[PDB]
Design a protein around this ligand. Sequence first.
Ligand SMILES: Cc1cc2nc3c(=O)[nH]c(=O)nc-3n(C[C@H](O)[C@H](O)[C@H](O)COP(=O)(O)O)c2cc1C
Length: 101
Amino acid sequence: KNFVISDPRLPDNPIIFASDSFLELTEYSREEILGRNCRFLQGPETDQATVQKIRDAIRDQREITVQLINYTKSGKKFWNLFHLQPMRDQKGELQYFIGVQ
Ligand SMILES: Cc1cc2nc3c(=O)[nH]c(=O)nc-3n(C[C@H](O)[C@H](O)[C@H](O)COP(=O)(O)O)c2cc1C
């Protein structure tokens, strides 16, 4: 129930949907999320080596799980177990990415 959907067919693969659980965890309103790339949750303590693996997984359109530090609106650190998965259409072509926190 804690998930976001991004559209890679739009500039910079922005979040088009976020579940109420995701808004509660990050302390952002729906209006502050829609249209942004998910990277805005990152900050000083975010391991750049883990961010690299996510970039490679998106490029290759492979599913991946990783732990990384993210920041709430009020600058509170929390660990995030992130399960990234591609979503393909009936013609086997990529439409969306789904993330789980
Ligand atoms: C559906 C989806 C959800 C994502 N959720 C997160 C997240 O919760 N935290 C995070 O640090 N990165 C998340 N990312 C990855 C970042 O938005 C971004 O891909 C990452 O920083 C690497 O790309 P960049 O090098 O262009 O920033 C998510 C990506 C997708 C497609």
